[PDB]
Amino acid sequence: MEPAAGSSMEPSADWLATAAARGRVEEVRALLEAGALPNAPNSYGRRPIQVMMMGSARVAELLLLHGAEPNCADPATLTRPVHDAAREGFLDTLVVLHRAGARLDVRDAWGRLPVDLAEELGHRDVARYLRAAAGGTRGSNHARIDAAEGPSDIPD
Known part of the structure; x- marks a missing residue:
C-alpha cells in the first residue's frame, strides 16, 4: 500500500545555495550555469x-x-x-539586490526593518545606504513625529 509516517525525504535542488553559504563562489558560478535552480528554496529558510x-x-x-x-x-x-546583507555588513550584496528589483522595504516581523537592524548591530555603511535604498516615512508625510497627539482615523 502507500507507506507514510511524517518526516519526508526529498532532496530537491539545493547545491547553488549550499555552495554560496560556504563562501564558495566557484562552485556556484559553475553550478548556476550548469543549470542550478535559480529559484530553489533551501531547507535553511534562508x-x-x-x-x-x-x-x-x-x-x-x-x-x-x-x-x-x-x-x-x-x-x-x-x-x-x-x-x-546589512546584518553582515556587506553593502556589495544590497547593491546587487537593488540591481535586480529588490524589495528593500519589508520588515523582519519584529525586526522593524533591515536598515534599523544594520544600524543597531554595526553596519552603519549599510544602515545609512539602506535608508536611502529602502526609503521610509512613505504614506504618512503629515506630522512626522511618532504617534502625534490625537486619535488618528483609520478607515479600512
Whole structure:
C-alpha cells in the first residue's frame, strides 16, 4: 500500500545555495550555469542568497543576475535577503539586490526593518545606504513625529 509516517525525504535542488553559504563562489558560478535552480528554496529558510554566507556579494550577483529570491523571504519572521546583507555588513550584496528589483522595504516581523537592524548591530555603511535604498516615512508625510497627539482615523 502507500507507506507514510511524517518526516519526508526529498532532496530537491539545493547545491547553488549550499555552495554560496560556504563562501564558495566557484562552485556556484559553475553550478548556476550548469543549470542550478535559480529559484530553489533551501531547507535553511534562508533563500538561495539569504544563505550565501553574506560575506561574498560576488555570489549574490551569480544567483540574483540569474534569478534568485532577493525579495521572497521567511513566512515566520519575514527575514528578507535585505537583512542578510546589512546584518553582515556587506553593502556589495544590497547593491546587487537593488540591481535586480529588490524589495528593500519589508520588515523582519519584529525586526522593524533591515536598515534599523544594520544600524543597531554595526553596519552603519549599510544602515545609512539602506535608508536611502529602502526609503521610509512613505504614506504618512503629515506630522512626522511618532504617534502625534490625537486619535488618528483609520478607515479600512
